[PDB]
From Swiss-Prot, chain B:
Residues 162-359 are annotated as: NBD1. Changing D179 to K/W/Y: Impairs prion propagation. Residues 83-145 are annotated as: Repeat 2. Has 2 AAA ATPase type nucleotide-binding domains (NBDs) per monomer, a low-affinity, high-turnover site (NBD1) and a high-affinity site (NBD2) with a 300-fold slower rate of hydrolysis. There is allosteric regulation between the 2 sites. ATP binding to NBD1 triggers binding of polypeptides and stimulates ATP hydrolysis at NBD2. Nucleotide binding to NBD2 is crucial for oligomerization. The C-terminal extension is involved in oligomerization. The modification Phosphoserine is found at S201, S301. This is Heat shock protein 104. Required, in concert with Hsp40 (YDJ1) and Hsp70 (SSA1) and small Hsps (HSP26), for the dissociation, resolubilization and refolding of aggregates of damaged proteins after heat or other environmental stresses. Extracts proteins from aggregates by unfolding and threading them in an ATP-dependent process through the axial channel of the protein hexamer, after which they can be refolded by components of the Hsp70/Hsp40 chaperone system. Substrate binding is ATP-dependent, and release of bound polypeptide is triggered by ATP hydrolysis. The lineage of its organism: Eukaryota, Fungi, Dikarya, Ascomycota, Saccharomycotina. Residues 1-145 form the Clp R domain. Induction: By heat stress dependent on the heat shock transcription factor HSF1 and the general stress transcription factors MSN2 and MSN4. Expressed at a higher level in respiring cells than in fermenting cells. Expressed in stationary phase cells and spores (at protein level). It comes from Saccharomyces cerevisiae (strain ATCC 204508 / S288c). Changing T312A: Reduces rate of ATP hydrolysis at NBD1 nearly 10-fold. No effect on oligomerization.
Amino acid sequence: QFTERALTILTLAQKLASDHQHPQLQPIHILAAFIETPEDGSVPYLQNLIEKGRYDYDLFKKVVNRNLVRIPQQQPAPAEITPSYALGKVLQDAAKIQKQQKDSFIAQDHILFALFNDSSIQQIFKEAQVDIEAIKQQALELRGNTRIDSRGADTNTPLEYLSKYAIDMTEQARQGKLDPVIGREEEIRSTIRVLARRIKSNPCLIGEPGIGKTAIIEGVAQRIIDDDVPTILQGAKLFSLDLAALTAGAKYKGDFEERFKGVLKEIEESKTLIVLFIDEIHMLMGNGKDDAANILKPALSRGQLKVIGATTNNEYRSIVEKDGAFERRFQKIEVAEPSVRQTVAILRGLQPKYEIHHGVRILDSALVTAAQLAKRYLPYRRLPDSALDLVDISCAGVAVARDSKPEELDSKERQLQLIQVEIKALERDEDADSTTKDRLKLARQKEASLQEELEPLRQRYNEEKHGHEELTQAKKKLDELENKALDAERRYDTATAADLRYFAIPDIKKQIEKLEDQVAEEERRAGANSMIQNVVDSDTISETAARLTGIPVKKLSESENEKLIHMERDLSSEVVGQMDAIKAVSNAVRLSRSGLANPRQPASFLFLGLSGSGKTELAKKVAGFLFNDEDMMIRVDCSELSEKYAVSKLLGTTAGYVGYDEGGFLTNQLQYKPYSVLLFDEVEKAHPDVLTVMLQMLDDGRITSGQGKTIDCSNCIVIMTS
Amino acid sequence: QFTERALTILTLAQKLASDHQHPQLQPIHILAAFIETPEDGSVPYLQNLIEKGRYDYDLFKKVVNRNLVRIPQQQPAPAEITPSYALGKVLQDAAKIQKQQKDSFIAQDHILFALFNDSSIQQIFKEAQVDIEAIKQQALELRGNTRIDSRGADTNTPLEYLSKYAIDMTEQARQGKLDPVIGREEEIRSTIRVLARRIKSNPCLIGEPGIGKTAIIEGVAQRIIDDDVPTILQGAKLFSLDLAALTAGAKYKGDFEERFKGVLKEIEESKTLIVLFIDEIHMLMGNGKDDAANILKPALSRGQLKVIGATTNNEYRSIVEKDGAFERRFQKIEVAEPSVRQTVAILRGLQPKYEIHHG
Amino acid sequence: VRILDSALVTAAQLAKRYLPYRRLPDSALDLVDISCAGVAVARDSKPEELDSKERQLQLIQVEIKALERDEDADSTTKDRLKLARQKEASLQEELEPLRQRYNEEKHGHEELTQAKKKLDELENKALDAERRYDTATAADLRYFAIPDIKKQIEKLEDQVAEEERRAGANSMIQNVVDSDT
Ligand SMILES: Nc1ncnc2c1ncn2[C@@H]1O[C@H](COP(=O)(O)OP(=O)(O)OP(O)(O)=S)[C@@H](O)[C@H]1O
């Protein structure tokens, strides 16, 4: 037969009769001719009959095909369509042409097997459909043993070919539709080799999200897409995926497995090298496991079936929990996060490429510092984003501050309402040539000019904004000269390697020069940029960071080292007490900023002695130097230190016991409390095993939770005192 | 006095019948039988109101539409006017003449297809058979109350679904409706960024209810409709609906989805830039958690053209706990509630209006 | 990839003793990967010489055509393009043997692997029934098939075409030192 899904392309028969109905129409026509496409029909546009399908290239058969079934006899809504003589037309011809494809039921492209003697509008080779070679032959030529679960594309073999929702690689940034990147390239490449590395080849390690590890895969794909590849790796494709029409199936199972298992089969067949990394099921499965592949691919790894993993380590270890063949098939790649130092060039590179988002210009550097300075201040975040985060945020606040150009606007909010008000009241008053107030009518001189000379400011603040528009907006185009070219070299093009490099190089630098050179100067503010139409981080961050955090204003600056000196030398001024402590303390800060100090671990320091006293300001006043929320510090009681561990600070329940809020206490705090000190009862009385445990963790300024999550920001101090 | 859109795409096809030629002639009806497509609705397409004769959603066999172009005149464009001999303007009275249905007058199928057996001159052919049907394309054209008094393309000119089952969003302001309640502008004025920002632009402010859940967007829309954006709102507009298009209904299943097919393309029709939330969390969330606008939302993150605002908080965290699954790639927060006097002031401002309502 | 492999072997025990928690031989097997990993490392596209030297020769072939058109390039101007074409030719020529050196060796080495592999087919196809006390059905095709393939082997195995570049070959160890892997 044809299929269960035959509705669509099969629906157009009564649609062909749709002029008026029909006592029946005929298998000379149907919307399956057009199928879902308005030219040649899926198959005889592309799918089956595109190249080889004989007649009806685009409008060939379908253009005039409707002549047969148009209009009824008398049909208000009596009837629609029916094959009649065509009823048995494909009946055996639907199930005959299948042979053994590794398939299930009757085929519409199987019904496309033998076509028909004459049912159609066309002359090609016969009275049958299209011309020749299509359907069962074309499909068999063009494919095999694959249609759809119980059904498929309506009338016609089926336009459906690849796995429904794909997320491109090859052609993805083939257009540069994604970005250049730097990152872990070899570090990556290392993997990427090993992505081949045979027998067990995929990475099946990775640390933790957020940073472009995705974006890696692409930069991965890059040299891959650069198609300079290990031949064994040479070809490939992925779409590293999630989800589907999946919830689509109501209450059914593996709606994935539905497309998915066929997707396997999609991928199963040959298609040369095509890489099947999906993404997250690692995170998935678990409980309420869906076994997308998780049972099957492990076997269905089968012949050369290639999927290359991405995830969080503890999340990963969260399957070290599940374990199993999660051992096998599974391999080892870390991740990292770099130094801002490392980071900037990235930060550098495409921020302009980004910038165009805001169509502004960028400042240079301290940004990044200030960003890293910032990075210190919202550190839960990934490194790179942070920029991006601030960046656009900056750019935003900028764009707010700037792109919204709300300088004149607030003026022109007030000053267009300050233009015509005071006008009519300044002309008259009782004392004219007498002296009581002799400035009386001076108040109209620049008043008439208030919004009036804001028109020059409308001019200016647009003028050199178009002096800034010329600056940025010309580039963004002129950007795409060298931009597209680098992607336009795509064939090893000397048409690209000369022409648009010419069209670049003569044009670019000149027009590059022009724009800042078309920024002359300004007397009110710096240079012809009126809004200044650029970005000063410090500024840009200040509020930002504020509107991130809190009153910087000291943090309107960094010296801190002198502050080290002075706040210290002044800790008196805020303490007046045991001074030498301050030193060692501050020395520890010097240490804290030594870093020539052993990187390991924040300072130890004293037990002080007694309580309820400067100890407490002592206890407090610390970040009063530093981070100046001494709200901060965490606490413990030696009392709380039992003779077994529950202790919910850290650890607590980790494996299989009751609750995972257990032990997060500090962590999640520490997580979002990357800087503090702790408290314990004098730290003194603490339970001995704890004392180990505490010092156990207290020692080693690099650790990870008893729940298995990184400990020791180690920058952050504790010193507890007894 | 009305239409010139539905009619403009129905009886106004005389202007499309000749660029300059045949002031009164019907060599070209239905935009002169060259226009648009059979896509959403407009232009030469499958049919005018309802046409079952030829392939649906398609203008002309071989080339799409473009039929009877360049009639037998030179440039007699504004002689006076008339299609179909002298009945062209009267062709705007035939939408109810055969009247399978579209509406009384001013319809694409109304004006042009108003001729039963007549369009301009072929016999009468765009998409149709005889008359009294108004069904084949008509229903498929979302006609049958597809007519409305707001400027639009009736039965041909527009195609509106998500657009039809829908809420104003955008215009709710330019047509005055509610006023400003001043307030958290600066917040929105902050959040104003959150709109234009590259990623995570999705702005849920999960603070106060009522006015204060409401009044925000509103003023936003105000501070939108003022149209002072550097960029986007110029080319951007907005959407919020909860069971607010077609059916909250229980008919069978997938009502959400059912509503979503609009939601699906909903922006991709790419009119302006349409980005906005309808409010609610669980609605944001879905049935328990379900995909409704939800698990599919990433595609819409992939579709961009986002949504915005939230609720009162906690269930934020709740889902944010339940998952930030996108919300991790969401970005926003809010503040909660201001104080007395400045409020009293805005109330001092808000004073007259509903008082004035009472006067 | 051939390697002398001896020390490489001995690397195991070490490498073994280095992360031996993993299953010693098959972990040692892991090395065998890691080896070819380290080789595939060396490999990438190509083995490792030009894909490295792609840093120069090809980026000097970028010098060959990168600057091909800027404002003006004729005789005396700021445009430095052409001069790379004079030199890299001979260099980029050697790529071709260098290319071959693994490739044409791989070409040969293709069969090499294939050779007894297919014997391990064919002599299994000999062994097809040899274990039933079946004999000649095998020997039938197996006649000369041993002393032809193996002869080709014998022929081709002997084939070096090095200057004498490294050993008896062209690029097989590709230049790959175990120790360094
Ligand atoms: N040189 C670079 N140019 C552009 N992007 C870069 C560069 N180096 C790193 N990236 C990353 O590209 C990323 C794009 O978004 P990402 O989400 O981080 O990709 P991803 O983070 O791996 O996906 P997840 O879920 O975030 S892990 C940014 O987060 C950057 O960290």
